[PDB]
Subunit: 237 residues, 4 copies
């Protein structure tokens, strides 16, 4: 199956699969059952920002989610991505709705990856930044119900013309080019991702969440992965 | 056919297609017959550097080629890429040999593209940098006789195991992801490319050259592109 | 005296010193009498953006000023900065009011300078970016009535507590560190600056303008440079 | 006194002040007696590279020193710089010789600092990169015996015309502009530094070392800080 490493912004507490009883951010290493979580005071209708960082020196994947004039939620987990992910991967954003729903709108997204090898001055780097999305964004691979163009934003899940989010939706957006996330001769490897989102929902319990993920190049939405599975995993194991 | 815009480092003077009677750099807008050229004192066996720049404000495509402790060749041409190229393109490097030959080795390559839109703070950017190439470089589309891995270098054309360049060779390397080179609402669009090369022939006259090009997404080596056509054009018109 | 090279956003037409009879942007090379101008449809109370670019290859200084959902004004001028400016300079922003006034608010400012030398891979670079200013901004040299901290903005000229701009005001802000603007050994030397501003006047007819300038390291506000002189020149010659 | 935070590349083991009995890299927080060290297999006459990184999310200062075709030494230390350093500081390089000596040559140096604020898209950044130093480097504050120009290198300590390092030497180089290393409102604060050095010694026992340091803006070489104090501390407490 696909190998997934993700940072989830889980808005709906699914107690049967191990979710805390409140909105939270978590680090998922090949399983929807987060390796570590942190309470997140999600703000309905407000624009938030997520920062994901990682470096091979201290092998720690960290994430911070904040809103203006509000405290930030933080979560970290020590993990050596060399032993989890293949050398070449694709990075993307995923989101879903189930019985309950919310808009999973991405306003901007940027990513940076660097491989600084042993040889003096032998750096390989990739950097992209979208501050507005086009109707025909040829450098993104859109899967599921993901669409671009609506107000220059990226809608991961389906929203009606009147702006109402729909349930039972799932969508993803991966950057077109494969990323060389790590290599053996690298002295220092690292990546950094940032995205701003707008989760708006009429429900008392918005669902299901957004997630930044890294996967094998040919990753695709596992069947029936709407709702609690965030479009990333085929089952809840 | 393909739409090509290229900066050629022409090492062999083909007088029948308009080449000056000496090595030169030139701006090719949809034709192997350069719109403007400049004498280039090519140095066999030495590592050179090429810098290509362009911006929509003053619509001028410029290039500079230099060698350490040597003068640089420069060429410029006013051209509005909006009227020549499609919004989405692919960028790459091309090279060829014919009756005569040379090594068309690329030691490093970097590219940066930015679209500063009308909407304040709405910048879109792409940046990649290869300071060493891998045997399996999944973010490059290699066409023709192009290969990577050899000393961490990109060999656009065929070289034997003993290092000897072969004639009648043609090869290209395009970056995997499509680049949004321009758009109607962009207040400023621009790009910059840089690469270092090592051209060396054991014969009297080297041939045929290296070229940085921008083309339609699905561009492919035209048949008969060997020799004077530098793997870019189907004919000499 | 000081050596000034500036891109002015002139809001008040001073016909005696050569100003066109309308708001305009212009390139000033050591004189308040612009070498080249362009009509600018200034929008009172709206946030605009200015982009200044320059590169030694095609020796052309260009500027673009735009507002969201509006056309942009553009002006260019061929000039070899090597012959005008000293190798080391300071970059900054200047503004003034005279009999009439306006707010000269800077919301953000970024600058990038690069020197690619003859020796392969030998690049020197400087880059700063302020998206919000602090009350104690130690990396800026504030001259005249310039202050920071008010809403995280830079006020080049004096504005009252109630937000009203004052006349007869002049202020500047230079980046603390000297910039190596050019050097003889460079193959390519280039810079790019961007800033967003908010010009507003209740009197309905604003004066005098804002300007991005490059000068000798020890530059200071010439005596009596309020009004038409934009705080850059000592006289109107 | 000055507040110093430094990563030392200690070549001479001073057992009385706590040095291990071999060359090592260490994290010094306000004291020459490192908080944590790591064995470093220094290679006389070879060019090495140092990478220092830090981020406020996981508050860990890490360093890696490597040589081509050789293992790298690594050292990390959890420390919240907010509680140690003032908001505004200066960054620099320091080096010294004592009874024994070595050349403390810096071939290149780059630094990047970013303050990601709570408010969406509010980022402040500073970045400089020197790949060659000039005889008159106006953006560096040279203290002690530090000089630039010699082959486009930075010599932290005194070396004779014939290239021989001298003992009892101490020199520093700080970047001209103050750096906003942190602020309360920042969601993420981080910095990264990289430099390549060439430590060559005539004898089989080099001394004393090179260090990347962060200090209060007005920092200066302490009296009698030659040798084992690396030009950073006034005493060995
Ligand atoms: C007990 C319960 C009450 C409720 O009000 O909604 C519920 C919704 C549930 O789950 C569904 O809605 C959730 C929120 O969309 C999804 O995570 C999940 O995949 C769906 O099966 C499960 C249980 C309940
Ligand atoms: C005049 C001449 C002399 C020669 O010795 O070889 C020659 C080879 C030529 O062309 C071939 O060799 C050239 C160099 O490889 C190519 O540019 C071209 O496409 C090939 O057809 C063209 C002319 C000559
Ligand atoms: C009295 C008067 C009437 C008028 O219509 O315009 C005037 C413009 C003046 O100019 C001053 O105000 C202008 C706008 O504030 C400045 O450009 C200029 O340098 C100042 O001297 C000064 C006086 C007048
Ligand atoms: C072997 C030796 C003999 C001696 O008489 O003094 C010595 C003094 C030393 O110390 C000085 O030289 C050392 C190496 O340069 C420095 O680390 C230290 O700060 C200096 O005081 C080191 C070694 C000796
Ligand atoms: Ca859940
Ligand atoms: Ca030719
Ligand atoms: Ca005027
Ligand atoms: Ca020591
Ligand atoms: Mn969860
Ligand atoms: Mn030609
Ligand atoms: Mn004017
Ligand atoms: Mn020590």
């Amino acid at each position: 199956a696909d190998t997934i490493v993700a940072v989830e912004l889980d808005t709906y507490p699914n107690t049967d699969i191990g979710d805390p009883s409140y909105p939270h951010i978590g680090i998922d290493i090949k399983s929807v059952r987060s390796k570590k979580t942190a309470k997140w005071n999600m703000q309905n209708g407000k624009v938030g920002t997520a920062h994901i960082i990682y470096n091979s020196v201290d092998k720690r994947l960290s994430a911070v989610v904040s809103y203006p004039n509000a405290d930030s939620a933080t979560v970290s987990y020590d993990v050596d991505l060399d032993n989890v992910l293949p050398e070449w991967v694709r990075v993307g954003l995923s989101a879903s709705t189930g019985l309950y729903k919310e808009t999973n709108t991405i306003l901007s997204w940027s990513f940076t990856s660097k491989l600084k090898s042993n040889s003096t001055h032998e750096t390989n780097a990739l950097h992209f930044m979208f501050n507005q999305f086009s109707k025909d964004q040829k450098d993104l691979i859109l899967q599921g119900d993901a669409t671009t163009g609506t107000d220059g934003n990226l809608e991961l899940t389906r929203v009606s013309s009147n702006g109402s989010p729909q349930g039972s939706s799932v969508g993803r957006a991966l950057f077109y080019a494969p990323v060389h996330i790590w290599e053996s001769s690298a002295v220092v490897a690292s990546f950094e991702a940032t995205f701003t989102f707008l989760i708006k929902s009429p429900d008392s319990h918005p669902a299901d969440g957004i997630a930044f993920f890294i996967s094998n190049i040919d990753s695709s939405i596992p069947s029936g992965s709407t709702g609690r599975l965030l479009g990333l995993f085929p089952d809840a194991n």
